[PDB]
Design goal:
- 2 copies of one chain form a homodimer.
- By secondary structure, the first copy, chain A, is mostly beta strands.
- The first copy, chain A, has one domain (about 1-195).
- The first copy, chain A, has 2 helices and 11 strands.
- Chain A has a 7-stranded mixed sheet with strand order 2-3-11-10-5-8-7. A 4-stranded antiparallel sheet of chain A has the order 1-4-9-6, with no helix packed on it.
- In chain A, a hairpin with a 5-residue loop joins strand 10 and strand 11.
- The longest helix of chain A is centred in the last third of the chain and has 15 residues, at about 180-195.
- Chain A is globular and about 45 Å long.
- The first copy, chain A, starts with 16 loop residues before the first strand and ends with a helix.
- Bound molecules: (2~{S})-2-methyl-1-azabicyclo[2.2.2]octan-3-one (QNN) (4 copies), (2~{R})-2-methyl-1-azabicyclo[2.2.2]octan-3-one (QN8) (2 copies) and zinc ion (2 copies).
- Chain A binds a DNA duplex through helix 2.
- Chains A, B: GO terms for molecular function: 14-3-3 protein binding; ATP-dependent DNA/DNA annealing activity; chromatin binding; cis-regulatory region sequence-specific DNA binding; copper ion binding; core promoter sequence-specific DNA binding; disordered domain specific binding; DNA binding.
- Chains A, B: It is found in: Cytoplasm; Nucleus; Nucleus, PML body; Endoplasmic reticulum.
- Chains A, B: Belongs to the p53 family.
- Chains A, B: Its cofactor is Zn(2+).
DNA sequence: CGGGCATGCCC
DNA sequence: CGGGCATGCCC
């Protein structure tokens, strides 16, 4: 009955975890992940690699879904959407969707008929031989600050592993801040965490 | 042949001048006019009174037109428009128009067929007996900072007095900055003028 | 109300 | 590149 999807971490029977490349906090970096905050800082429309880790290999036909939700209680029931400006500015991705996947010939974009929430889905592919994870290249097509979209409200990205039958196999999430200067904003929030948290 | 309307002050044979109420520079004022900068600072969608002064009474059927243009040379040829967000948010005023007139049952909104520029027109009415000017209540429906609209670019409002035949009778203009805190921004720009101009 | 931070971006 | 200002708004 809820229109708010779960954000509860569920590693599940396949040991599903997310991973992120080690970047620095240089003021001009295009993205950087804070493990202390479980938070990705990245720039508008630029690659944001997410690693998928599993302890056991999911069955054939497993799918990987990404969806954004507002992190604060007072905004959780509102659907996260592209702002009118960037919407009016790919072909496969409808202009209303915040999250895109690049580099994948099998991407599917969903608008839920009951909850109206947007998600983007790709097939799960096992890591190549010798590699321990699979990487998906996400793109966030608005800044957190965009008026008429996120309007400065923080968001979570929820990644779910789902089998072809629709069984939830795993769930993980991270906060995302799409901003002009990811390195500066990570440094500021981490400093604020240490001194005022 | 030019698609850029004139901004040249032309008092004309009727002695046409603009006037503005004396406001202060309190941080929360809804609008304030700087004579030193010939610049109105005002808030989004709130009243911005403009006084019309004439030395001689224009003929019956005179009209008062307002139009915005970008002040900087590099943007002058681009049409000033409402941003996509506030456009998607009166009835008589088309959503694309930046400048509205409130309180007037005879307002006309024009989209020029050749230049595509927007303007808003009302009849000229002489001042009431004993009064020296006529006031028009303008509304600016975007902030200067709106992405996809003015996008932080400065603008002029050009007020023209025109007879019913379309003869230009007078022209005046002022800079406009639609901002959150008109009193603060006037104080800052005037201080910057005095010390760095 | 006014002080002050967060965030985009400096033509 | 990084320093720093301008501007919206603080839940
Ligand atoms: C944002 C992400 C990238 O695209 C590379 C630079 C920074 N971070 C790790 C690798
Ligand atoms: C963070 C800041 C920089 O360092 C350049 C890229 C992003 N932003 C504007 C210029
Ligand atoms: C903005 C304009 C108004 O509406 C009154 C207050 C400030 N200024 C003069 C009168
Ligand atoms: C300027 C500042 C104020 O003083 C209030 C009105 C406008 N802005 C936000 C709150
Ligand atoms: C997760 C794993 C790694 O650490 C590197 C880059 C991505 N994957 C294969 C090698
Ligand atoms: C221009 C003139 C004034 O100064 C007051 C207010 C508006 N007009 C009539 C009286
Ligand atoms: Zn946007
Ligand atoms: Zn706007």
């Amino acid at each position: 009955s809820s229109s708010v999807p779960s954000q509860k971490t569920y590693q599940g029977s396949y040991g599903f975890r997310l991973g992120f490349l080690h970047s620095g906090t240089a003021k001009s970096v295009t993205c950087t992940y804070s493990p202390a905050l479980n938070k990705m800082f990245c720039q508008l429309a630029k690659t944001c690699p997410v690693q998928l880790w599993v302890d056991s290999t999911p069955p054939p036909g497993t799918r990987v879904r990404a969806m954004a939700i507002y992190k604060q209680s007072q905004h959780m029931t509102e659907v996260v959407r592209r702002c009118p400006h960037h919407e009016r500015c790919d072909g496969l991705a409808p202009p209303q969707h915040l999250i895109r996947v690049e580099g994948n010939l099998r991407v599917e974009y969903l608008d839920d008929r009951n909850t109206f929430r947007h998600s983007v889905v790709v097939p799960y592919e096992p890591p190549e031989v010798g590699s321990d994870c699979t990487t998906i290249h996400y793109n966030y097509m608005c800044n957190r600050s965009c008026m008429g979209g996120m309007n400065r409200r923080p968001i979570l990205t929820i990644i779910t592993l789902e089998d072809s039958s629709g069984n939830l196999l795993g769930r993980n999430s991270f906060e995302v801040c799409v901003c002009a200067c990811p390195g500066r904003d990570r440094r500021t929030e981490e400093e604020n965490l240490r001194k005022k948290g």
